[PDB]
Design a protein around this nucleic acid. Structure first.
Lengths: 201, 103, 180, 146, 185
RNA sequence: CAUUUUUGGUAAGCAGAACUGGCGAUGAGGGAUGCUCCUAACGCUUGGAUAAGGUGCCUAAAUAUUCGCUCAUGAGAUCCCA
RNA sequence: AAUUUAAUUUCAAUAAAGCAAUCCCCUGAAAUUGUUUUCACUUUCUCCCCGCACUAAUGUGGGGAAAACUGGCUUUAUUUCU
């Protein structure tokens, strides 16, 4: 885009679309912090996805697994791998795009202070029917033993509660700003005040 | 503040590629606001300036410029073809460009 | 006018006859109405039927008329019954279907869509033998019987889509599905 | 017999479902040549598609569209099912639905946006200047409050 | 297919409901029962004053009709459970060996000894809120009771599954504890 | 070598014929890749608009529109083509 | 962004009149070669009866009426109200 850092809250987003939108932006040019990446959705079922990951694990090398593939277990790394698949990563242009991507499970607090964006076409609600089975990427990762989950669960809750305290304070501040604005709208010269009202204040 | 910019922002994308084929005569430009052919058509004839920073003093200065002009779209989402007076470098792909308000 | 929901399948009334000969001192004139995407297609289907029924190929006859046939009341929705001969991979079948639509042409487009979608039958493998307006009480399809109820007022329940301009790449907050 | 205080009970139901595809309900087109225009629901062709008919104000003919292309509004006017353009004009003029829409928050956001879109260069400066006067006064009031 | 499918579900007089956003909760004399139906996307609405619930689905398919009939049956079971606990009477059958049924942990875990003369212990703990009592009236009978038909049945199934033989003929050897009679208090 | 007709041989990316078109002697664009399939035959350049073919990303254009059908505890997905 | 005069069973209002009520612009269902004749079909936020809240519903299942607002036809003028 046209901004230093996009932060993306990746909860409720569907894997392929989330990856594709991120990738084209990286190619266009953008540093992108993918945040909250266990709450990504895969469209398959839990068993079906477990089967797919089983096939992925089965793929290795006869020769020497020291020169084998990487079976990354982090849900963030799973997204990263998918984005890597959607990049020409054996190039320099692809490598630069690859370097621009940053991935994190849960909300890292320096980037929770920052604004979070979402990708509106990529939500589970948006492109999947209600009555058709799906599975959360963190749930699948837990099933195949990533197991760094409870710590994040505790951390996210603590962050969210503080965010509630922050939100109420923000609401308090905004309400007070509205109150002073409405009072001091009277003090404006009539014509100017009428113009400002006309254009939506 | 002190400066007033008086252009709109863009991103110099690649040259006018097609799958596994290159045309270097035409360059592809992303203009920040646009997302349609119809909206892009408003800006179609405008003069475009690529300004860039260098290591040594040239004519006493470390800033240089390439000029081009927008001329036709490259898609329904308003990504636009621009023809330049000399080809812009692949080194400058993903860099910023200035789209002037004239003619 | 439209190109956002448009059907280019139209109906043509076509008339032709046998060339006069010593044997055929008084010809027989033949008329038919035919649904086609263009006049050449309409004529070729008319000619194919003239060949299938009669001994008359394009060479043996002369065209008296071809004209597109005009919708009486386009604002009114009507109950069309349509009778088919179609070919499957392993056989030929007859079928009789009901569609409520504004016009016969919309119904034929709908029929090709239905046969293609549900049966894999291409336009080439379908033959409409009669499409006509019929009474509402005589429909056999439950989905059309449901429309014909006194009070029709369902909730809409579909996704937003907008258009290209306001088709944003990213968003600050998550969308509202309900829309109210 | 008829409702007495059961009238309150039916009134004060909390039912989610609203904005039914009733004949004469106002709808905002979101796609196609006539996008951004308001229109009434006449007929229902099928599950996907409906017969829509513009307001005389909005300038959209009677026509089939998919329901998916509409964003339904709260207001609805009850009419007989067979009605055409004269009666629709007479009814719309009677019921003054566009005023209700203007009052409505979505309508209000749209009309404010429309003014802002059409605003001239001097008008734009005047909005800037007015906000600047407001901030000066408002900050002075913030000084006042402590 | 259909545009509209409905159901009108009678509610007993004493039921204390709390069913918002398809998280159904019913309370009554024997307990508060909570059971989500949020996977099922239907418009159950309550009526307090004239009792009953009205369930309606928009744009039904036979799958949806199956869901409506299933939910109404399930809801009725929830009402039935809180009003009167579901009791699964399980008879213990043996043709040779005394099988010793010793209820421990305040009616929460039945200890079973001596299936097919095994001289060993099978302990089978119940699920939450399902009490395992024995019958004073009939020596082989065991009462499995609780507010939910599914948990009591599952508890009974666990008891059957725990008992059953590996490899001595199923036709020949009939011994074990089975569900005779499904009732309520 | 290919389509179509075709003989022998269980069959064969097998042997043997017929008509025509290719390759050989041929770049170029597509067919994911590929001597032969499809599009199409070539001085050097500029611009246009198209073909075969595409338009989720790699990878250029639609997460286009529109109606059906489709959930698979090894689904399916562009002739030759596995 | 448009535009000209033709062509092709193309309207829609405007406000005064009339005309018919399962009736009509229509559309059904019936008794080589043409006719032509039969009765079937609208609305309602109108009214009534039974079921009295029995409904998906700011109503309702069944049974009946009422009208011509709605639609349809015949007119008379009118077209930048539309």
């Amino acid at each position: 885009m046209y901004k230093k850092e996009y932060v993306i809250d990746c909860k409720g987003h569907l894997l392929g679309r989330l990856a594709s939108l991120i990738a084209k932006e990286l190619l266009n040019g953008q540093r992108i912090v993918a945040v909250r990446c266990e709450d990504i959705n895969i469209s398959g079922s839990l068993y079906r996805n477990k089967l797919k990951y089983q096939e992925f694990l089965r793929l290795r090398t006869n020769t020497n697994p020291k020169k084998g593939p990487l079976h990354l277990r982090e849900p963030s790394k799973i997204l990263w791998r998918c984005v890597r698949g959607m990049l020409p990563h054996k190039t320099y242009k692809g490598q630069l795009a690859l370097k621009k991507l940053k991935v994190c499970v849960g909300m890292p607090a320096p980037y929770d202070k920052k604004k979070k964006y979402v990708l509106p076409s990529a939500l589970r609600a948006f492109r999947l029917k209600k009555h058709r089975r799906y599975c959360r990427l963190g749930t699948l990762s837990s099933r195949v033993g990533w197991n760094y989950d409870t710590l994040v669960k505790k951390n996210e809750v603590l962050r969210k509660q503080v965010s509630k305290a922050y939100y109420k304070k923000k609401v308090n501040n905004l309400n007070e700003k509205k109150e002073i604005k409405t009072e001091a709208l009277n003090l404006i010269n009539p014509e100017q005040r009428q113009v400002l009202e006309n254009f939506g204040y | 503040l002190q400066a007033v910019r008086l252009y709109e922002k863009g991103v110099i994308l690649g040259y006018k590629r097609s799958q596994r084929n290159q045309d270097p005569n035409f360059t592809l430009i992303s203009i920040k606001n646009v997302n349609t052919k119809k909206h892009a058509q408003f800006y179609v004839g405008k003069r475009v300036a690529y300004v860039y920073r260098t290591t040594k003093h040239h004519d006493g200065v470390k800033i240089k410029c390439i000029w081009g002009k927008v001329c036709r779209t490259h898609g329904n989402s308003g990504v636009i073809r621009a023809k330049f007076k000399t080809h812009i470098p692949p080194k400058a792909f993903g860099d910023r460009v200035r789209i002037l308000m004239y003619p | 006018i439209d190109n956002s929901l448009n059907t280019n399948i139209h109906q043509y009334h076509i008339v032709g006859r046998a060339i006069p000969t010593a044997k055929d001192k008084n010809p027989n004139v033949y008329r038919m109405c035919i649904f086609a995407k263009n006049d050449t297609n309409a004529k070729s289907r008319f000619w194919y039927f003239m060949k299938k029924i009669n001994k008359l190929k394009k060479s043996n006859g002369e065209l008296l008329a071809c004209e597109q046939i005009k919708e009486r009341f386009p604002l009114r929705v009507k109950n069309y019954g349509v009778l088919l001969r179609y070919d499957s991979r392993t056989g030929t079948h007859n079928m009789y279907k009901e569609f409520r639509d504004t016009t016969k042409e919309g119904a034929i487009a709908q029929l090709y869509s239905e046969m293609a979608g549900r049966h894999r039958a291409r336009a080439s493998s379908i033959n409409i033998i009669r499409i006509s307006e019929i009474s509402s009480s005589l429909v056999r399809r439950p989905h059309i019987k449901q429309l014909l109820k006194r009070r029709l007022r369902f909730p809409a329940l579909h996704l937003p889509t907008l258009q290209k301009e306001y088709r944003k790449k990213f968003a600050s907050k998550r969308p509202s599905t309900y829309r109210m | 017999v008829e409702l007495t205080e059961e009238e309150l009970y039916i009134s004060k139901k909390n039912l989610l479902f609203k904005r039914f595809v009733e004949p004469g309900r106002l709808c905002l087109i979101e796609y196609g040549p006539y996008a951004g225009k308001l229109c009434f629901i006449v007929d229902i062709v099928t599950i996907t598609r409906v017969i829509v008919d513009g307001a005389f104000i909005t300038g959209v003919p009677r026509m089939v569209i998919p329901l998916k292309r509409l964003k339904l509004l709260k207001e609805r006017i009850k009419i007989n099912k067979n009605c055409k353009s004269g009666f629709l004009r007479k009814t719309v003029n009677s019921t003054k639905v566009l005023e209700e829409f203007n009052n409505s928050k979505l309508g209000k956001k749209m009309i404010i946006k429309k003014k802002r879109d059409e605003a001239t260069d001097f008008e734009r400066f005047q909005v800037y200047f007015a906000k600047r006067e407001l901030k000066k006064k408002m900050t002075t009031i913030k000084n006042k409050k402590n | 297919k259909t545009i509209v499918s409905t159901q009108k579900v009678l509610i007993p007089e004493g039921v204390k409901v709390a069913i918002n956003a398809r998280k159904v909760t019913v309370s009554g004399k024997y307990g508060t029962l909570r059971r989500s139906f949020r996977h099922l996307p239907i418009d159950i609405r309550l009526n307090k004053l004239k009792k009953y619930i009205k369930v309606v689905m928009w744009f039904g398919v036979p799958d949806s009709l199956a869901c409506i009939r299933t939910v109404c049956t399930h809801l009725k079971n929830m009402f039935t459970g809180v009003t009167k606990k579901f009791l699964y009477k399980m008879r213990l059958v043996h043709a040779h060996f005394p099988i010793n049924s010793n209820i421990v942990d305040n009616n929460t875990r039945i200890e079973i000894r001596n299936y097919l003369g095994e001289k060993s212990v099978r302990f089978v703990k119940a699920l939450p809120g399902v009490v395992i009592e024995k019958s004073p009236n009939v020596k082989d009978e065991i009462y499995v009771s609780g507010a939910d038909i599914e948990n009591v049945s599952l508890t009974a199934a666990l008891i059957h599954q725990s008992v059953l033989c590996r490899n001595k003929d199923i036709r020949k050897f009939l011994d074990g504890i089975y569900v005779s009679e499904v009732t309520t208090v």
